[PDB]
Each structure stands twice: as C-alpha cells, then as structure tokens.
C-alpha cells in the first residue's frame, strides 16, 4: 500500500496491496466489486493524465502572457481567429469540432478496443523508462499521485474562477500580495454570512 488516508483506520479488503496509489481510501465502497474496480482504475489513470495536460496547458498559457484558460475559446464567440504561441490559425470553430471529433473518436476507439489497457507500452514508451517491471511500480505511484494533484488543481482552477473571475496566475499573485485580505473567505460566495 502507498499509505493510510485515515490514520488508525483499517484498509479495505477489496483494494489490492500492489495497486498503485492504494491509500485505502474508499468510504463509499464504490470499488467493492472487482469488475467496477478495473474500470474505475483505468478511468482514474486517464483522468489524471488528461488533468495533468490541462493544468500544464493552463499554467503555460497564463504564464506566457497569452490570456488565461477561461478566455481561450472567446475568439469564436464574438468573431476572431485562434492564435497558438502568437501564430494565427485559419481553422474556424466548425472545422475544429469535426477534426477533433474524428481524431478523438479514432484514438479512443483504438484504445478501448484493447479491452481496457492502462499501461500499453511499446510505441507509447520509446525511451524505455519502464522497461523493467521492478521500477514500474514506483513510477506508476508518481504518475497516479501527480494525476490526483492535477485533478484537484483543475477543480480548484474552475472553482476559484467561478468565485473571483481572475485566472490561476492572477489569483496566486493577489494572494501573495494580500494573504489575509484575499482568500476564499473574502470572495463573498464561499462564506455567506461573512
């Protein structure tokens, strides 16, 4: 196991010890059945990877001075052209949905046709960082932990944006400037009475 989410509590018997990121956290008993645990495991790894990509993209776009993550698709709401790294792109919203739909449908269909594979390897690992299965368990733990942190970070991004209006980088600078005066308790919607 990776640890104990609640110190003093006993780990559930339905969570295998060799499972990466197994902290024994399952109070709702969602993964009680083995068939559900497999799908939820693959879903969690996929969610972590997508969240890592999303958080990295949002942080990079706001740190490079190209707006925040919320104002990215605003060009197709009032008329405009999308720009990547300051370079104009001539693809309109209609051509983007079709190409993304076809590409994502083909890639996801190929991935799902394998029978729910979480660690394919081979072509997806050209550098061979996980060639040996001894060090594979350690890196898998880092991947699932970074993915969980990224999922929490993306949820925080959405919540803080819907609560204040600024982006993640702008919210961090404001909190660094005034920690006691700017936090979730001073937005006006998290705490209603105060």
């Amino acid at each position: 196991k990776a640890g104990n989410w609640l110190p003093g509590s006993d780990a559930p018997a339905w969570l295998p010890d060799d499972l990466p990121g197994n902290y024994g956290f399952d109070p709702l008993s969602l993964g009680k059945e083995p068939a559900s645990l497999k799908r939820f495991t693959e879903s969690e790894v996929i969610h972590g990877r997508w969240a890592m990509l999303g958080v990295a993209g949002s942080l990079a776009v706001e740190l490079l001075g190209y707006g925040n993550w919320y104002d990215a698709p605003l060009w197709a709401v009032n008329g405009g052209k999308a720009t990547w790294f300051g370079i104009e792109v001539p693809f309109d919203l209609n051509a983007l949905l079709a190409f993304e739909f076809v590409a994502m449908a083909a890639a996801e269909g190929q991935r799902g046709d394998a029978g729910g594979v979480v660690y394919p390897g081979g072509a997806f690992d050209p550098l061979g960082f996980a060639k040996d299965s001894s060090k594979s368990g350690e890196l898998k733990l880092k991947e699932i932990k970074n993915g969980r942190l990224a999922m929490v970070a993306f949820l925080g991004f959405v919540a803080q944006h819907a609560a204040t209006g600024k982006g993640p980088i702008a919210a961090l600078g404001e909190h660094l400037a005034n920690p006691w005066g700017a936090n979730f308790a001073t937005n006006g919607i998290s705490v209603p009475f105060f």
Partner: protein, 210 residues
C-alpha cells in the same frame, strides 16, 4: 445505588450511574443517559463543552478585570459581545476560515481517537513523537500534559475539572442572559448588584421592565 455522593440525599438515583465517570452525583431526572452509547457520547460532549466554557469565561472576565485597573491595551473598552465588529489585522471572514480548517484537523483527530482509543497517538510527520499507550478518550496527556500533573490523584483532579467546567458553563449561560436582559457587561452587573443587593435582584430588575 451506593454510598457515592448524591444531588439529593435519600433520593433513588438511577443504576446506570455507578461513579465511573468523574463528578457522578446521580443527576439525571430526564434519564438522558439510559443508553450506554448515548452516555458515552454525552461524557465527551460535557468535557468539551466544559473546557470551552472555562476558556470562554476566563477570556470574558480577564479583559474586563484588567480594564477596570490601570492596565491598558488596544481592545479595552470593547465588550465581549462587541468584540466581533472590532478592527483587527485580518478580516473576520479570513480568521473564520483559517480557524475552521485548523479546528477541522484537530477535531477529526480527536474523533478518530474517540472511535478508536490509541489510534491517533502517533504524530503523522515525526514518527518518533508519540503519546503514551495508556490513554482514555477525552484525556490525551503526553504533550498535552508536559508538567506531569496527571501522575498524582487523577480522580480528584478530574472531579475538580468537571466541577469547574459545570460552573463555567452556568456562568456563560448567565453571561448570555445578563447581556440580553440588562444589556451591560457581566462585571458591571456584579458591581451594580454589589452596590445594593437588596434593591438589585433579578426579580426587581425584571419587574421594572414589565
């Protein structure tokens, strides 16, 4: 049903109160402690409410006592019920959020030790730091008792604690009542009553408003 002290000499006290809990006087006319699990929970609730009320009464009486003398500091003339709308270094909302997170951590740790005694005595960061194995819920000890005062008569000290806690709980209830009726701080009410107790009673003061 023994020679233990009673709240009514001669009365037939209930049998579920055998003196195991501190300050047992057989006082339960509503029979709220009939269920053993309910009584076990109420003991911890009484201990927590008593300790918080003791801290509250001390924190209400000490600033007013120091304000009536030459001692001065920023918040002196402000009453205990008026301290909320005071200008501090941080807004009340921020302090409320910070304290809610900190109290969430300590209260969940306390609840974990309550449902499983001895399961929260280990420090999560420093594995070497820990509390002694012999412990009971509501009485942590260890770092919470650095002077080792519990090494003596633990029964007498527990009785003193529960008695002082009950007195402080009644004192806080009296603080709320006096602030709602007289609309003045408790020490001022005490001084007003000490000036002439025959004409300054709850009956006289409440009859003057009827």
């Amino acid at each position: 049903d023994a020679a233990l002290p009673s709240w009514m000499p001669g009365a037939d006290l209930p049998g579920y109160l055998n003196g195991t809990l501190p300050g047992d006087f057989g006082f339960d006319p509503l029979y709220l402690g009939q269920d053993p699990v309910k009584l076990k929970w109420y003991a911890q609730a009484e201990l927590m409410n008593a300790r918080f009320a003791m801290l509250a009464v001390a924190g209400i009486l000490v600033p007013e006592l120091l304000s009536n003398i030459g001692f001065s500091w920023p918040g002196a003339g402000v009453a205990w019920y008026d301290a909320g709308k005071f200008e501090y270094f941080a807004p009340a909302s921020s302090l409320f959020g910070v304290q809610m997170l900190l109290f969430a951590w300590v209260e969940i740790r306390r609840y974990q030790d309550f449902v499983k005694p001895g399961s929260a005595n280990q420090d999560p960061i420093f594995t070497n730091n820990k509390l002694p194995d012999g412990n009971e819920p509501g009485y942590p000890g260890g770092i919470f008792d650095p002077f080792g005062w519990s090494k003596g008569d633990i029964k007498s000290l527990k009785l003193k604690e529960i008695k002082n806690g009950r007195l402080a709980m009644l004192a806080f209830a009296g603080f709320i009542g006096q602030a709602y009726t007289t609309g003045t701080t408790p020490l001022k009410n005490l001084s007003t009553h000490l000036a002439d107790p025959w004409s300054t009673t709850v009956w006289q003061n409440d009859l003057a408003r009827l």
